Design a binder for these strands. Structure first.
Lengths: 227, 71, 190, 163
RNA sequence: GCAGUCGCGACAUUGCUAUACCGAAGCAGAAUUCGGUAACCCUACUGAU
RNA sequence: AGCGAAACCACAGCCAAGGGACGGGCUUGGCAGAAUCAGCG
RNA sequence: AGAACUGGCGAUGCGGGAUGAACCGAACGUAGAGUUAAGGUGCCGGAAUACACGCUCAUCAGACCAAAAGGUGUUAGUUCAUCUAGACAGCCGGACGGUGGCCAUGGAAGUCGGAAUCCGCUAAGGAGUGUGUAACAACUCACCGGCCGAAUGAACUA
C-alpha cells in the first residue's frame, strides 16, 4: 500500500525492432548518408525539409536503436567503417539516405534556414521589451493598431510562470514599466523562450547542420561542419 | 447583479492572486484527506462513506473498461 | 522492508562550514549562522572530505528511512539560506478600501501592522520573528518583501501575514482584498 | 416539472419493520425518479433569481438596433449601471437595465443585445412588444456596425408594424 | 415488496405500487441552506455538637 | 419535676461492576473517622 | 419445535477460570516426604520482567455476531509485463498538413452538441483528456525526441 496512483497506445520495443529492420534493409540501397542533430525543429519545418527532396529517405528513432542498426562497433558494422557514424553521432537521431550529389546536399543543408523562437542558451537577437502600458499579443514590438491586446485568461501564467509584474486593469493585462526580458546578446533562459512562444514571435533563425557524412560504396565516414 | 455579475467580476479582475495555487494544493491534499476520512467518521457516517467509495470504485472500473474496449 | 543500512549524501560548498554535535547541526557562512536541532530524527552523520556529509540510518524501517530522507533536504535548505538567503515578495491588492501596510516597532518586536483592510476598524498585525527582515518593494506599489536565512521562519511569517488578513466570510471571488505571495526565491539569486 | 413536484408531494415486530422500510424506500424511489425535474429546477433557479428588475409600470426607455456599435456607452453614461461595450459580434445575451432620475422622476433604460431567429433577439422583441416604453433605434453612417445601411433600413421597415 | 436487465451473483439498473466557530451553494449586501466541533423506612439530604 | 408502655425483632446498614437466571453477608474496585441533636425531603 | 443415544447435574467434594450449576483436569479415610493434571510464572499471586524467530500505535487496540468491502496504514507472497537496443519518475523539446471535414447555426474550428471517427507523413501525434477565450488564441496528456540513473508499474493472495 501507499504506492503512487486517452486512446493512444505505446509503440515500444516492437516499433524499435521494426525501425531497426527498416534501417538495415534500406541503408544499402543509397549512396550518401547524413547524420543531423535536429534538436528543436517545428513540424512544418521538418515537413519542408522532407519535401525538399522526396527522393531522400528520412530515418529517425531511438539513438541506441539507430546505433545498433548501423552497427555499434566494427564487430556489428553493417558496412565497413560504418560504426564510425554511430560512434560520432551523439545528439538527436536525425538521419538521411540520398543519391544526390554530396556537394549539392551539403550546400542545400547549409543554405536552409527558417524563422523560429530563440531557444534557451541562445543569444538575444534584440532587447525585447514589453511596453509600460497594456501588453499585446506580439509583446508590444509592433504598433497597437497592428497588435491585439492580450486577454486576461492567461494573466496568471504571465504573473507566476514567467515571473513578470503583470496585473489586471479592467480585464486587460498591463505592466507598470517597460519590462525588458533580455538585453542585446543576452543568454536566454527557459522563461524567455516560453514568453516568446506565448507571443508567437519567431525571435531568431535556425538552420539544420549535418553532424557527419558517410559514403556507402567507398564505406567511409567524414566530417562536414556546415554551421 | 445584471444577470452576469459573478462572471463579469472574474473577467474584469480575475480570481485571487493565488486561487489556482490554493485549489491545486487542496486537490493534492485530497489524496490524504480521503484516507483520513475513511479512517475517521465512525458509525452510520462511516458505513455510508464506505458504500459511496465502493460504488465510486465500481463505476470507475466500469468506465475504464468501457473506455479500453472502445478502442 | 527493514533495510540494513540507508544513507543520503549532502554537498557542503566551500563558502560555508558545518559543525555536528550529537544531534545539533550548526551551519556558518557569509550571510549568518543557523543552529538547527534534529534531536527527534535519530540519524547518524559522517564526514567524507569536509565537503561531503552522509546522513544514515541502520536497521531502520520505512518510516525511519522516510524521516532520514528529509535530513538531506533540511540541511540543503539551511545551506541555501546561509549562502544565498531566502526572500518572499507579497503583493497586497484591494477593491475599494486601500490596504495600508505599516512597520512599527511597538513593544520592540518589529510589529507589522495592516490597517484599513476591508474597512475594518480592528488593526491586524503579526510580530516579526527573529532573524527575518522586512521592507517595502521599490517601484512595486503595494508589495512587501521579506528576507532572511531561515526558510522556516520566513515562510511562517509570510503565511501568518496572509492568514491574519483573511476576509470575514464574504464572497471569495468578489472581495479580493488581502495579501498573497507574489514571488519566492533567493536574495542573491543566480 | 411543476406537475411532477406536485405529484411527488401529493403521492405521500418484523412486519412493522418491513412496513417502515417499504414507506422509506417508496419515498426514496419517488425522490430518485424526481432527480430529472429536480436537476431542471436547480438549473433554472440558479439563473432566474438575479433576473433583470424590469418594472413595466415605470418609465421605461429602450435602446434597440443592430449589434452593439458602441451605443452601450450611451446607456452607461445615462445610467450608472455598467454594461459591456466590447465591439465584438454580440455583446450581451440578455436584457440589461439601469435606473436613473430626471426632473425628480424615476426612469429605467433597457438595452437590446441586437436585432437582425434567435432567442437573444426574441427576448428583446417580446420585451419591446409587451412592455410600455419609449424606443430609440440605432444606426451607423460610418464604417462601424458592419451591416449595410440598406439592410438596417430594411430591418427597420420590417419591424415597423409592431414597433 | 415482486419481477428483469448484470452454477452460485457485489454497487448501480427498468417496469407497478438554541447559540458560537469552520468549507461550500451563482456566497454582489442582508438573509438562507448543506457537512463537522454537540448543546417509627436502609443509602439519604443538609445545618451542627 | 416525677410515673411510664405497646407494635416489631434470623442478623446489620456506603456504593460501582460481573453474577451468563437472585444479589444484603460471592467476586473485583473506590473508600470507610468514634459518638451524637435537629428541618423533613 | 419433534424422535433418538451417549457423558455432568441429580445424589458431588477438590484445583484454575475476577465470579457463573452446563467450561478442562480430577472423583474424597487421618498424616509426612516427593512428582504432576488443568491453569499459570510483573505485582495483588506461590512461579523466568526465560531464550528464539516477526507482526501493532489502536484517539477507551489486545489479553472475549450484521461486515461483504475501503484506508496515500504497515508487512510478506502469486500472474503479467518493460530493462544497460536504457525499469518508474524528474527536467527540456516536437506534439503535424488536408482541416476551419459535414450538420443543427450570427459561433462549437478539438473541447454547448450528432453522426463519423476519414486519409497523408512519420518519431508521434486522438476531427483531440482537460484548462479557457464570444469562435479563433495560448497551455496541455498520451504519443514520441534529448540529460539522470536499474529495477519498476499494474492485477490478485495474505
Amino acid at each position: 500500500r501507499s504506492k503512487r496512483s486517452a486512446q493512444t497506445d505505446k509503440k515500444g520495443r516492437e516499433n524499435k525492432e521494426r525501425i531497426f529492420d527498416e534501417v538495415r534493409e534500406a541503408l544499402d540501397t543509397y549512396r550518401y548518408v547524413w547524420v543531423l542533430h535536429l534538436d528543436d525543429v517545428r513540424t512544418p519545418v521538418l515537413q519542408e525539409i522532407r519535401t525538399s527532396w522526396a527522393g531522400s529517405k528520412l530515418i529517425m528513432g531511438k539513438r541506441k536503436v539507430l546505433q545498433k542498426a548501423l552497427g555499434e562497433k566494427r564487430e556489428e558494422e553493417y558496412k565497413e567503417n560504418l560504426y564510425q557514424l554511430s560512434k560520432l553521432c551523439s545528439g538527436v537521431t536525425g538521419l538521411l539516405f540520398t543519391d544526390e550529389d554530396v556537394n549539392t546536399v551539403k550546400e542545400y543543408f547549409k543554405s536552409y534556414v527558417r524563422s523560429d523562437y530563440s531557444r534557451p542558451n541562445t543569444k538575444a537577437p534584440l532587447t525585447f521589451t514589453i511596453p509600460e502600458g497594456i501588453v499585446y499579443s506580439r509583446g508590444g514590438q509592433i504598433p497597437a493598431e497592428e497588435d491585439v491586446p492580450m486577454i486576461h485568461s492567461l494573466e496568471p501564467t504571465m504573473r507566476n510562470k514567467f515571473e513578470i509584474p503583470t496585473k489586471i486593469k479592467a480585464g486587460k493585462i498591463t505592466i507598470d514599466s517597460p519590462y525588458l526580458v533580455c538585453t542585446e546578446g543576452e543568454k536566454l533562459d527557459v522563461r524567455q523562450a516560453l514568453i516568446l512562444k506565448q507571443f508567437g514571435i519567431a525571435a531568431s533563425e535556425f538552420k539544420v547542420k549535418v553532424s557527419a557524412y558517410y559514403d556507402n560504396d567507398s564505406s567511409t565516414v567524414e566530417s562536414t561542419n556546415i554551421n | 447583479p445584471q444577470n452576469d455579475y459573478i462572471e463579469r467580476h472574474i473577467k474584469q479582475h480575475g480570481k485571487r492572486l493565488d486561487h489556482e495555487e490554493r485549489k491545486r494544493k487542496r486537490e493534492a491534499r485530497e489524496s490524504h484527506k480521503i484516507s483520513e476520512r475513511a479512517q475517521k467518521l465512525t458509525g452510520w457516517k462511516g458505513k455510508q462513506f464506505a458504500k459511496k467509495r465502493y460504488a465510486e470504485k465500481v463505476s470507475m472500473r466500469k468506465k475504464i473498461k468501457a473506455h479500453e474496449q472502445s478502442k | 522492508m527493514k533495510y540494513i543500512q540507508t544513507e543520503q549524501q549532502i554537498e557542503v560548498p566551500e563558502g560555508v562550514t558545518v559543525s555536528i554535535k550529537s544531534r545539533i547541526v550548526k551551519v556558518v557562512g557569509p550571510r549568518g549562522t543557523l543552529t538547527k536541532n534534529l534531536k527527534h530524527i535519530d540519524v547518524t552523520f559522517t564526514k567524507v572530505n569536509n565537503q561531503l556529509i552522509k546522513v544514515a540510518v541502520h536497521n531502520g524501517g520505512r518510516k525511519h528511512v522516510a524521516a532520514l530522507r528529509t535530513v538531506k533536504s533540511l540541511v540543503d535548505n539551511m545551506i541555501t539560506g546561509v549562502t544565498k538567503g531566502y526572500k518572499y515578495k507579497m503583493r497586497y491588492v484591494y477593491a475599494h478600501f486601500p490596504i495600508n501596510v505599516n512597520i512599527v516597532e511597538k513593544d520592540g518586536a518589529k510589529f507589522i501592522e495592516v490597517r484599513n483592510f476591508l474597512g475594518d476598524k480592528k488593526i491586524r498585525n503579526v510580530p516579526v520573528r527573529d532573524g527575518v527582515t522586512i521592507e517595502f518593494s521599490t517601484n512595486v506599489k503595494d508589495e512587501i518583501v521579506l528576507s532572511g536565512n531561515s526558510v522556516e521562519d520566513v515562510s511562517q511569517n509570510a503565511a501568518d501575514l496572509q492568514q491574519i488578513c483573511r476576509v470575514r466570510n464574504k464572497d471569495i471571488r468578489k472581495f479580493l482584498d488581502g495579501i498573497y505571495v507574489s514571488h519566492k526565491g533567493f536574495i542573491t539569486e543566480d | 416539472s411543476l406537475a411532477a413536484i406536485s405529484r411527488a408531494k401529493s403521492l405521500v415486530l418484523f412486519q412493522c419493520k418491513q412496513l417502515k422500510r417499504a414507506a422509506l424506500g417508496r419515498m426514496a424511489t419517488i425522490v430518485k425518479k424526481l432527480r430529472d425535474p429536480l436537476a431542471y429546477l436547480e438549473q433554472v433557479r440558479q439563473h432566474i433569481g438575479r433576473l433583470p428588475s424590469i418594472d413595466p409600470n415605470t418609465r421605461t426607455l429602450l435602446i434597440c438596433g443592430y449589434p452593439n456599435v458602441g451605443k452601450s456607452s450611451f446607456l452607461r453614461c445615462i445610467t450608472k449601471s455598467d454594461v459591456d461595450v466590447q465591439p465584438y459580434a454580440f455583446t450581451t445575451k440578455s436584457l440589461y437595465v439601469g435606473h436613473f432620475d430626471y426632473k425628480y422622476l424615476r426612469f429605467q433604460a433597457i438595452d437590446t443585445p441586437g436585432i437582425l431567429m434567435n432567442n437573444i433577439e426574441m427576448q428583446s422583441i417580446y420585451a419591446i412588444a409587451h412592455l410600455r416604453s419609449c424606443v430609440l433605434y440605432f444606426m451607423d453612417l460610418s464604417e462601424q456596425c458592419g451591416f449595410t445601411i440598406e439592410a438596417q433600413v430594411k430591418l427597420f421597415h420590417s419591424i415597423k408594424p409592431l414597433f
